[PDB]
Amino acid sequence: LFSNQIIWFVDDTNVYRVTIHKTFEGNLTTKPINGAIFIFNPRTGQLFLKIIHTSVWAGQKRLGQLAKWKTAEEVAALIRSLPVEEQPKQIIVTAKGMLDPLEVHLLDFPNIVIKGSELQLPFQACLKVEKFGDLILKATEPQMVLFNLYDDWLKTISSYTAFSRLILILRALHVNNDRAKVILKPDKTTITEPHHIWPTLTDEEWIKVEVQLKDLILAD
Ligand SMILES: [Cl-]
Ligand SMILES: [Cl-]
Ligand SMILES: [Cl-]
């Protein structure tokens, strides 16, 4: 996972999003809201966030199915925009419905291996992190935004350790957002830098946090 080969995880979970409301007449209305594709490099921490504006669905039906195809289209478009040296060698998807769309969209890229995964990597949780949630909510058109999901961690820990830390954060936020946010703020003075995603914590603080997040996930 952290070798010389560029690897991307691709998450389509958040592409097609809706709000459901029961009207005064007793029927359900379903209205799309903006979504996002998450494309993540586990070695470097790079995230490509492709915001999906609701206008893309105009006209269309079976939007949850079409979202798999839209995701594959956008992955291919990103790849086309990158020099060959920056293109991934492997694309890993935790949703099985992404496999066939990606295969058909990436026929011009014979070097790229597509595989499925049973890992729990819930980028959905990022919608709970104000930076991402508000950006996605308020967008008025599609756009791509770059992030570094490991902040400054790699100065002192390995990619393996950083990946493990990130997964514990995402899973804990997914399972119990309120308690995870408390765990991640151990002191009144804990802050997150404006250009960071996650709090600035000491090594001792991260040790305790990681154990607490793991325990939270186990308690579900
Ligand atoms: Cl884009
Ligand atoms: Cl490593
Ligand atoms: Cl989870």
UniProtKB/Swiss-Prot annotation:
Annotated region (RNase H homology domain), positions in chain:
1-220
Q: In which tissues is it expressed?
A: Widely expressed.
Q: Where is this region: Involved in interaction with pre-mRNA 5' splice site?
A: 1-220
Question: What's noted about domains in the record?
Answer: The MPN (JAB/Mov34) domain mediates interaction with TSSC4 and SNRNP200. Has structural similarity with deubiquitinating enzymes, but lacks the residues that would bind the catalytic metal ion. Contains a region with structural similarity to reverse transcriptase, presenting the classical thumb, fingers and palm architecture, but lacks enzyme activity, since the essential metal-binding residues are not conserved.
* Function in brief: Plays a role in pre-mRNA splicing as core component of precatalytic, catalytic and postcatalytic spliceosomal complexes, both of the predominant U2-type spliceosome and the minor U12-type spliceosome. Functions as a scaffold that mediates the ordered assembly of spliceosomal proteins and snRNAs. Required for the assembly of the U4/U6-U5 tri-snRNP complex, a building block of the spliceosome. Functions as a scaffold that positions spliceosomal U2, U5 and U6 snRNAs at splice sites on pre-mRNA substrates, so that splicing can occur. Interacts with both the 5' and the 3' splice site.
Subunit relationships: Part of the U5 snRNP complex. Component of the U4/U6-U5 tri-snRNP complex composed of the U4, U6 and U5 snRNAs and at least PRPF3, PRPF4, PRPF6, PRPF8, PRPF31, SNRNP200, TXNL4A, SNRNP40, DDX23, CD2BP2, PPIH, SNU13, EFTUD2, SART1 and USP39. Component of the U5.U4atac/U6atac snRNP complexes in U12-dependent spliceosomes. Within the minor spliceosome, which acts on U12-type introns, interacts with PPIL2 and RBM48. Core component of U2-type precatalytic, catalytic and postcatalytic spliceosomal complexes. Found in a mRNA splicing-dependent exon junction complex (EJC) with SRRM1.
Name this polypeptide is given: Pre-mRNA-processing-splicing factor 8
